[PDB]
Amino acid sequence: MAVTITLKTLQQQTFKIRMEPDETVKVLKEKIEAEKGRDAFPVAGQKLIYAGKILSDDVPIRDYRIDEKNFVVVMVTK
């Protein structure tokens, strides 16, 4: 009974990834990266931004309260 995250790159792209607030975000990286690719959002540099703060693959999605109603920004170094 997972939720539905919502991500958004640099405003150009906006999507969502079921996932769950429990996972360490890394799993999300795998999904989002599966949507775009290792060129668009490689799990490596797949950084996310919730409430102006940053979140890595090792941090919990719950730590950033990344709920469906909200969306985080998937920024990746480039």
CATH number, domain with residue 58: 3.10.20.90
User: Quick check: 61 and 5 in contact, CB under 8 A?
Assistant: yes
Residue 65 region by backbone torsions, left for phi larger than 0, else alpha for psi between -120 and 50, else beta: left
Q: What one-character DSSP code corresponds to residue 31?
A: H
User: Quick check: 33 and 48 in contact, CB under 8 A?
Assistant: no
What is the rounded CA–CA span in Å between residue 76 and residue 13? 13
User: Which run of H or E residues covers position 15?
Assistant: strand 14-15
Experimental method: NMR
Domain enclosing residue 71, as ranges? 1-78
What is the rounded CA–CA span in Å between residue 71 and residue 74? 9
Q: What one-character DSSP code corresponds to residue 48?
A: E
Question: What's the domain count of the chain?
Answer: 1
